């Protein structure tokens with residue numbers, strides 16, 4: 109028996125969510141649909157301009173871990189909060205979902221990371237993230253027994269921003285592979301890819317990462333191309349398995365020369381796209397560690413992602429397992 | 439001109455919201471549909487048993503003030519938070535809505551009040567409130583110039599639980615009436631009425647409160663009767679104006695011998711009733727301070743209430759002013 113199906117590792121963040129008009133993004137020089145890193149001063153400035161908000165636990169990998177547990181898989185998470193009220197919210201929410209979460213805060217300062225997420229009328233989300241205590245995640249936070257006893261360890265490209273998180277990830281890759289497990293990453297964001305393109309390619313080509321998640325824009329950014337067919341050909345050459353999401357066009361799963369196209373589910377409306385990619389990874393990795401086919405992995409991914417975009421908040425409030433049973437994916 | 443249409447005064451609370459099954463309430467001895475006061479230990483305990491949650495600024499009177507501002511009225515609020523992250527959330531949300539809010543925190547202990555609100559499948563809400571910093575609200579928090587410059591000062595029955603808040607309210611009543619303004623209260627909760635029945639009747643009969651809000655169960659509780667018609671007759675005898683809500687049956691406005699019945703909005707699905715009474719008061723008081731007929735005040739209250747119960751969270755995220763325009767209430 110393996111204690112865990114999926115361990116995820118990421119920036120532990122609490123989301124502060126508000127709807128805005130299109131001009132708000134322009135007026136405030138916020139790059140639409142992207143993750144915009146901000147300092148403490150800018151965080152205070154943007155917050156002062158933000159309307160009344162809602163808070164919900166976030167963090168890309170955090171959401172993925174939660175989604176896996178929701179579907180019924182066994183999940184763990186590494187990510188660093190502060191000993192403050194926001195960190196207590198993050199800690200509660202992830203543990204309440206049944207995710208193993210044992211990363212110890214180092215003190216109250218820097219405070220727990222938060223992301224001000226502005227949702228436009230089209231349902232797109234634009235994130236403004238102060239990393240706070242996420243900068244203290246390092247090799248000391250690697251629970252070696254957890255990595256050794258997890259079928260897949262999945263991590264965010266976003267971890268390349270804080271200074272020492274990469275060292276933790278390299279330790280994870282070593283332990284995971286020594287114990288016959290698989291490593292996975294998400295490219296996270298097209299600008300994050302712009303920042304760490306060479307390093308991400310090295311992770312894939314050195315075999316430190318076995319399974320890569322990307323959306324269309326990230327895959328284009330990885331190879332600095334406008335040719336999507338080139339991007340798919342190259343990503344398939346650079347990693348063992350690639351899962352590439354294409355928004356309303358669903359996704360394509362790649363393994364060597366194999367290609368499996370999956371449709372997006374029918375949706376009422378795009379309420380808020382926050383979490384779509386994360387929950388795609390949840391569905392995929394749940395299916396994968398249940399020994400399902402790559403196509404059914406894609407189907408589970410598209411189901412989980414389709415559900416999350418129909419609600420405010422990055423973690424489905426409804427039962428994904430029930431949804432999966434209802435959709436005949438079981 | 440008057441600087442403010444409506445000042446509200448209440449327990450400043452951040453809500454922590456989760457959906458639960460019916461049995462959860464029974465297993466944890468939570469009185470359904472009521473405000474259950476809890477101590478710090480019980481707060482920790484219930485939180486440990488609560489699923490993943492969302493946080494949103496709450497507090498009955500806070501919600502009401504926010505509602506008035508959303509409608510286009512000029513609102514102010516008195517309520518005490520702590521110097522902590524929950525308090526910063528509370529402060530941001532209310533100020534961001536355009537409500538004057540200048541109550542100063544006194545320290546970091548007790549921490550900002552929070553209420554764990556469990557929403558059952560029927561849309562009913564059961565609140566479990568640790569008062570925290572609210573126990574510090576007192577006469578020192580009365581901005582006398584604001585009370586003098588507000589057409590109506592409205593407060594919670596809930597304020598009779600913390601020790602010194604009633605002193606602040608008596609100060610408000612004196613100032614309001616000396617400047618020819620009106621005082622209003624809500625009965626808040628039927629168990630709250632059970633606790634403070636005599637005191638609430640005294641507030642009305644002595645003329646300290648001019649306008650009273652009640653729902654059916656509060657009105658029945660106030661006179662310890664099963665006869666709603668008796669409760670209406672008696673409440674009208676006890677205060678100048680009474681606004682009595684009847685859930686899906688709308689509301690009735692009473693003044694002397696005058697009665698004005700108003701229909702409820704027909705509801706698709708009741709998502710979460712949290713805030714319904716609060717937003718009824720927003721609409722009513724907005725209409726009242728705009729010189730509208732009592733019926734129209736009731737219509738505006740029912741409009742705002744119907745809106746809030748169709749969303750998660752106690753403060754409408756949509757434009758109430760726009761909704762009022764569409765409804766010809768303007």
Ligand SMILES: Nc1ncnc2c1ncn2[C@@H]1O[C@H](CO)[C@@H](O)[C@H]1O
Pocket residue numbers: 118119121122123143165166167168169171223235237264266267382383384385386422
């Ligand atoms: N720099 C970051 N690293 C990891 N996750 C992030 C970052 N910024 C925003 N997020 C999270 O991305 C999620 C949506 O993918 C949101 O819930 C938000 O918390």
Ligand SMILES: Nc1ncnc2c1ncn2[C@@H]1O[C@H](CO)[C@@H](O)[C@H]1O
Pocket residue numbers: 448449451452453473495496497498499501553565567594596597599712713714715716752
């Ligand atoms: N003791 C209390 N005093 C004032 N408001 C409260 C109390 N308990 C819960 N609430 C608020 O009641 C609101 C719903 O009417 C919620 O937003 C919640 O914050």
Ligand SMILES: Cc1cn([C@H]2C[C@H](O)[C@@H](CO)O2)c(=O)[nH]c1=O
Pocket residue numbers: 323353354355356358359372373374375378381384385388410413414417
């Ligand atoms: C219908 C739909 C699905 N999704 C799902 C399917 C994608 O593979 C996933 C990641 O974007 O989210 C959208 O993102 N947008 C949509 O409009």
Ligand SMILES: Cc1cn([C@H]2C[C@H](O)[C@@H](CO)O2)c(=O)[nH]c1=O
Pocket residue numbers: 544545546547548573574
């Ligand atoms: C006003 C205040 C009260 N308290 C304590 C004293 C009481 O035990 C409790 C309720 O007033 O809070 C503080 O710890 N710090 C403060 O600043």
Ligand SMILES: Cc1cn([C@H]2C[C@H](O)[C@@H](CO)O2)c(=O)[nH]c1=O
Pocket residue numbers: 653683684685686688689702703704705708711714715718740743744747
């Ligand atoms: C419970 C409920 C309340 N309401 C509105 C009308 C009431 O006057 C107000 C307070 O309960 O909320 C509805 O419109 N429909 C409902 O089902």
Ligand SMILES: [K+]
Pocket residue numbers: 380381382383416417418419420421422423
């Ligand atoms: K969402």
Ligand SMILES: [K+]
Pocket residue numbers: 710711712713746747748749750751752753
């Ligand atoms: K609500």
